[PDB]
């Protein structure tokens, strides 16, 4: 993953 | 007339509303209807508990329905709010009913954090209040008999449903009053008393002596068994014990007196006398020993009158021999009575205030469906992208498809010309340059928001700490430090997110400046572009070469494969199945929800047609790339190497690589932008959560 779209979505 | 009833259990009052409201709001979108009607429900629920339990007072069916109402409602709540997952500090506290324990006390309490404890206790109180209403009934009267017979059978059934329910709910040792054995004895006392009522109804209605004898004998059976259960365990109030014994004897004496009227009728005269004698003995004994608890005179006068009259007739006329009791046939038994099953709703006119609320079981299947669906779809997208990236790279490092469209070495190959115009259409380098320039600005914005927010907490904390130091007495609220640590943790979290974003800006900056110049060339108008690509001699045997037509066709189908990946990706993304209704069914018709096996088969029906094609794409690529490379290896042997076409050759490979980079960069730069934009959303909310907690404090 490039940008932390994982961290962002669960928030 | 004297019947046993049970006293109610006392509770302390507890706020049902606010621990339940905490969950409701954390579950549904704040400021919505799916959160409005449930808070109105949880507060009316708290009020209802107060009316049902808050005072042991009222003593008729008005207050009973309220108790039953509360039982039904509490049972309806259970499959919603997560109780079967200990973390709600809603703890219920009840007293023992009988001031009873297995230790030398005066009273004993049990505080427990369980709905299974709450509902056993409410049920027990439902039962007990029912027993009291029954005992109060006028048994001269047809409505009285009936209301007594229905309440005892309710109490017996409620007491028995507690007996089979307590342990699996109450993960502890229950107070004595609600333990299996006590509650099994109470149930049997209530059933015996129902039989008593039915014996009274048959008496009042002047039914045959044969029927009355059997109803009374059965009542004695029930009373004797309850008596026996009490003999080696003292868990009920002190009066229960002798009342059971007296009622056991009275019901035997009744059995015998009626059977005696039967013996007479059949001219069994010595039998009349032996049964009357037994009745007399039992009642003589009940009157001396249990005088405090029963009045038995009328019955005793009636027995004596029958006995004397029968002995006069026998001594003078019949001369029948009086047998011994042991040689008499048993009186039969007839039960008219049953423990009433407990089946919610037990109240009249019941409505579940929370009916509309979705069962927790479904959430932890609906949210779990999401994480399986998401795994499947992203997985599939990622595989395809990673594949297309790898194909384009291989193609570029072989100058395909440029090499085969390169008639002379004099013009722009059609494919490079297509890619160029495609870059120019998308705005050329201006679009990448503008997105590079604003990335530091969307970062800075988000830093400003995070920082402004934490500054707030800091400011408030400083004055709070200074007020505690100066106005020790006047200023005692919990410190700011402690209220704020939850928010400060989200703070350092966001910080970590921003750092990984910066690292990602790094990769994109490095890539952009490393590919800028070649991209600038690709975007130049066609004559200008041509002048910057070196010319070369055609290796003229590129007429209708068969090694060319194969490459052309292999490359055409590799093209086909990668354009098809776009529709696959879009369809993978545009479809979805709402899964709630399926889970509703699986739960209403079966015990629980088996989401694992149920979702896998649904994901296969919805996404199987696509995940199949995606896997067929990869294998098809692997086939195509393998023999594209063995086919090219032959193609290069035919057309030779000089420096004029080596130079043109690199420029062409580098122009194709430039296209891939413009495309990869535009996408990375948009991912970056969207991320930094959606992060401002999350952080504006965080700024508000901070300004709100500083405004309340």
């Amino acid at each position: 993953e490039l940008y932390p779209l994982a961290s962002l979505r669960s928030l | 007339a004297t019947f046993i009833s049970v006293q109610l259990k006392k509770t302390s009052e507890v706020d049902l509303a606010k621990p339940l409201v905490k969950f409701i709001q954390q579950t549904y979108p704040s400021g919505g209807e799916e959160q409005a009607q449930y808070c109105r429900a949880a507060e009316e629920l708290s009020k209802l508990r107060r009316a049902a339990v808050g005072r042991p007072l009222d003593k008729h069916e008005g207050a009973l329905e309220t108790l039953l109402r509360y039982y039904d409602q509490i049972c309806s709540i259970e499959p919603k709010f997560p109780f079967s997952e200990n973390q709600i500090c809603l703890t219920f506290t009840w007293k023992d009913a009988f001031d009873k324990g297995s230790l030398f006390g005066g009273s004993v309490k049990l505080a427990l954090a369980s709905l299974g404890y709450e509902k056993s206790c409410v049920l027990f109180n439902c039962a007990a209040l029912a027993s009291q209403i029954a005992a109060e009934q006028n048994l001269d009267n047809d409505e009285g008999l009936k209301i007594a017979a229905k309440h005892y059978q309710f109490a017996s059934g409620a007491f028995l449903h507690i007996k089979e329910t307590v342990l699996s709910a109450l993960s502890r040792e229950p107070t004595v009053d609600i333990s299996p054995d006590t509650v099994g004895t109470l149930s049997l006392i209530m059933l015996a008393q129902a039989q008593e009522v039915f014996f009274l109804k048959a008496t009042r209605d002047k039914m045959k002596d044969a029927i009355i004898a059997k109803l009374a004998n059965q009542a004695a059976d029930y009373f004797g068994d309850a008596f026996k259960q009490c003999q080696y365990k003292d868990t009920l109030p002190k009066e229960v014990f002798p009342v059971l014994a007296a009622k056991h004897c009275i019901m035997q004496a009744n059995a015998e007196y009626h059977q005696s009227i039967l013996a007479k009728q059949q001219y069994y005269f010595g039998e009349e006398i032996a049964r009357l004698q037994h009745a007399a003995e039992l009642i003589k004994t009940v009157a001396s020993r249990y005088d405090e608890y029963v009045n038995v005179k009328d019955f005793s006068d009636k027995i004596n009158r029958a006995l004397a009259a029968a002995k006069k007739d026998n001594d003078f006329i019949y001369h029948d021999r009086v047998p011994d009791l042991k040689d008499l046939d048993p009186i039969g038994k007839a039960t008219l009575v049953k423990s009433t099953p407990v089946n919610v709703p037990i109240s009249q006119k019941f409505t579940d205030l929370f009916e509309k609320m979705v069962p927790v079981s479904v959430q932890q299947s609906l949210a779990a469906y999401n994480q399986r669906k998401a795994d499947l779809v992203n997985r599939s997208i990622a595989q395809m992208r990673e594949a297309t990236t790898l194909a384009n790279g291989v193609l570029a490092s072989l100058n395909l498809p440029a090499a085969i469209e390169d008639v002379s070495g004099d013009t722009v190959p059609q494919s490079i010309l297509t890619k160029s115009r495609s870059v120019i259409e998308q705005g050329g380098i201006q679009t990448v340059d503008q997105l590079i320039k604003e990335l530091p600005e969307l970062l800075q914005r988000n830093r400003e928001i995070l920082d402004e927010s934490l500054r707030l907490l800091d400011e408030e904390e400083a004055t709070d700490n200074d007020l505690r130091a100066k106005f020790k007495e006047r200023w005692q609220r919990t410190p700011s430090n402690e209220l704020y640590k939850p928010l400060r943790a989200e703070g350092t979290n966001f910080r970590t997110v921003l750092d990984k974003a910066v690292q990602a800006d790094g990769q994109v900056k490095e890539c952009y400046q490393s590919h800028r110049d070649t991209i600038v060339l690709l975007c130049k108008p066609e004559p200008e572009l041509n002048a910057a690509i070196p010319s070369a001699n055609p290796a003229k045997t590129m007429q209708g070469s068969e090694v060319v037509n194969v490459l052309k066709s292999l490359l055409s189908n590799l093209d086909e494969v990668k354009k098809e990946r776009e529709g696959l990706e879009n369809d993978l993304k545009s479809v979805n199945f709402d899964m709630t209704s399926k889970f509703l069914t699986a739960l209403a018709q079966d015990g629980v929800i088996n989401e694992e096996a149920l979702s896998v088969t649904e994901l296969d029906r919805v996404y199987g047609g696509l995940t199949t094609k995606v896997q067929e794409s990869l294998k098809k690529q692997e086939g195509l790339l393998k023999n594209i490379q063995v086919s090219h290896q032959e193609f290069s042997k035919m057309k030779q190497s000089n420096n004029e076409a080596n130079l043109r050759e690199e420029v062409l490979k580098n122009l194709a690589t430039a296209y891939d980079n413009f495309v990869e960069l535009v996408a990375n730069l948009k991912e970056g932008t969207k991320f930094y934009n959606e992060l401002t959303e999350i952080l504006v909310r965080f700024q508000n959560k901070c300004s709100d907690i500083v405004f309340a404090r």
Side-chain angles (χ1 to χ4, degrees), chain B residues 132-326:
Chain B
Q132 291 177 227
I133 292 158
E136 235 191 346
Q137 293 314 298
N138 169 18
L139 277 28
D140 268 21
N141 172 81
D142 284 349
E143 255 266 284
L145 296 166
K146 177 171 179 63
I147 286 169
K150 148 175 159 276
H151 289 317
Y152 288 125
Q153 290 174 102
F154 173 86
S156 176
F159 278 143
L160 191 71
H161 181 264
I162 294 172
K163 171 177 147 98
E164 320 280 17
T165 275
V166 260
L167 295 181
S168 294
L170 206 151
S171 212
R172 278 272 144 273
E173 210 160 342
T175 45
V176 162
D177 64 359
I178 45 157
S179 90
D181 299 297
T182 312
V183 95
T185 300
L186 281 176
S187 178
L188 181 51
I189 292 158
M190 291 311 130
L191 199 56
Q193 290 189 138
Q195 202 31 47
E196 212 185 338
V197 167
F198 274 99
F199 150 79
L200 259 10
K201 184 174 182 319
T203 285
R204 173 147 162 76
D205 294 358
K206 275 277 184 271
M207 307 188 50
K208 271 187 195 62
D209 299 283
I211 291 153
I212 301 181
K214 290 184 182 161
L215 300 174
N217 207 31
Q218 184 60 278
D221 190 65
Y222 287 140
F223 276 121
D225 285 25
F227 173 70
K228 273 176 274 182
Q229 282 169 215
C230 296
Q231 214 160 357
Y232 303 101
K233 287 221 102 286
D234 196 29
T235 56
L236 311 171
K238 38 144 161 259
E239 300 75 24
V240 171
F241 193 64
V243 161
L244 281 181
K247 280 197 160 301
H248 174 40
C249 291
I250 298 173
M251 286 291 110
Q252 286 185 269
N254 275 306
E256 292 277 35
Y257 167 80
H258 291 292
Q259 187 80 15
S260 86
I261 294 180
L262 214 69
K264 193 178 173 203
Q265 266 159 25
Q266 275 150 29
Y267 313 111
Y268 302 144
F269 289 116
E271 198 204 324
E272 194 190 352
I273 289 156
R275 292 190 183 285
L276 287 170
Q277 280 171 166
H278 192 216
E281 198 183 16
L282 291 160
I283 290 293
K284 208 172 173 332
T285 289
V286 163
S288 26
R289 187 179 294 157
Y290 310 111
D291 50 311
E292 292 206 331
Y293 309 95
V294 295
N295 192 336
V296 95
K297 192 75 191 302
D298 304 321
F299 191 30
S300 165
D301 285 2
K302 202 219 291 297
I303 297 165
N304 295 341
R305 279 182 306 242
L307 173 59
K311 287 234 259 263
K312 179 182 268 272
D313 282 336
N314 193 58
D315 291 337
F316 286 94
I317 323 167
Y318 303 117
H319 303 115
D320 219 31
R321 148 113 163 85
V322 185
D324 269 327
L325 311 148
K326 60 165 194 166

Side-chain angles (χ1 to χ4, degrees), chain B residues 534-546:
Chain B
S535 40
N537 294 86
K540 296 162 188 166
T541 324
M542 200 159 56
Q543 204 80 109
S545 184
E546 206 223 340

Side-chain angles (χ1 to χ4, degrees), chain B residues 252-537:
Chain B
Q252 286 185 269
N254 275 306
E256 292 277 35
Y257 167 80
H258 291 292
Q259 187 80 15
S260 86
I261 294 180
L262 214 69
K264 193 178 173 203
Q265 266 159 25
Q266 275 150 29
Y267 313 111
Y268 302 144
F269 289 116
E271 198 204 324
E272 194 190 352
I273 289 156
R275 292 190 183 285
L276 287 170
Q277 280 171 166
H278 192 216
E281 198 183 16
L282 291 160
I283 290 293
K284 208 172 173 332
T285 289
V286 163
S288 26
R289 187 179 294 157
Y290 310 111
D291 50 311
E292 292 206 331
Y293 309 95
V294 295
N295 192 336
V296 95
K297 192 75 191 302
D298 304 321
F299 191 30
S300 165
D301 285 2
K302 202 219 291 297
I303 297 165
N304 295 341
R305 279 182 306 242
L307 173 59
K311 287 234 259 263
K312 179 182 268 272
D313 282 336
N314 193 58
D315 291 337
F316 286 94
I317 323 167
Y318 303 117
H319 303 115
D320 219 31
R321 148 113 163 85
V322 185
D324 269 327
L325 311 148
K326 60 165 194 166
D327 280 28
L328 302 177
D329 295 315
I331 300 162
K333 299 193 230 296
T335 192
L336 246 30
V337 111
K338 254 157 202 164
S339 293
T340 305
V342 167
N343 281 120
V344 302
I346 61 179
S347 49
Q348 297 157 25
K349 273 70 193 307
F350 177 62
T351 21
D352 180 9
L353 313 160
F354 308 79
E355 168 142 358
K356 262 49 256 171
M357 183 167 198
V358 197
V360 154
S361 168
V362 159
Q363 259 59 281
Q364 283 169 344
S365 274
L366 222 38
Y369 171 71
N370 263 49
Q371 188 63 60
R372 278 156 179 269
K373 174 211 81 168
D375 263 1
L376 181 149
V377 58
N378 303 319
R379 203 150 147 80
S380 305
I381 308 303
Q383 274 180 128
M384 280 164 108
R385 292 201 191 300
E386 276 137 59
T388 294
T389 289
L390 182 140
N392 291 331
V394 170
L395 296 184
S397 66
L398 303 168
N399 189 34
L400 299 169
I404 59 163
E405 265 289 68
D406 193 12
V407 250
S408 61
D410 207 331
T411 64
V412 180
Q414 184 50 76
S415 37
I416 274 101
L417 202 61
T418 291
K419 283 155 183 168
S420 158
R421 290 180 285 199
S422 149
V423 178
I424 297 159
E425 171 143 3
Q426 288 177 251
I429 196 85
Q430 158 54 21
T431 52
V432 173
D433 280 330
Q434 216 202 117
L435 292 156
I436 278 290
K437 209 195 151 293
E438 85 191 345
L439 212 61
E441 282 158 288
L442 314 162
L443 173 65
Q444 186 49 35
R445 172 211 271 163
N446 294 115
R447 279 216 221 281
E448 273 158 59
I449 300 170
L450 186 147
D451 288 346
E452 283 169 283
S453 302
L454 296 171
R455 182 205 145 191
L456 249 165
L457 304 179
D458 296 347
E459 278 173 64
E460 204 294 299
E461 184 175 48
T463 60
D464 171 64
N465 301 326
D466 300 9
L467 297 155
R468 188 153 301 111
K470 219 96 225 295
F471 299 106
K472 324 97 161 300
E473 276 195 24
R474 318 287 197 283
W475 196 264
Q476 50 186 75
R477 316 107 55 88
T478 59
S480 291
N481 258 279
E482 283 279 52
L483 249 113
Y484 297 156
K485 78 131 184 183
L487 293 160
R488 262 154 196 182
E490 284 172 31
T492 79
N493 211 109
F494 281 122
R495 212 93 78 164
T496 319
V497 153
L498 288 171
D499 290 25
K500 271 54 160 64
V502 168
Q503 194 97 353
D505 298 335
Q507 323 288 9
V508 179
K509 257 174 166 159
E510 183 149 21
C511 176
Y512 154 76
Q513 63 185 111
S514 205
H515 293 115
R516 191 225 168 37
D517 306 75
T518 316
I519 291 167
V520 175
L521 181 62
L522 180 64
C523 302
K524 301 206 164 306
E526 176 194 296
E528 191 181 358
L529 171 55
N530 192 225
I533 316 160
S535 40
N537 294 86

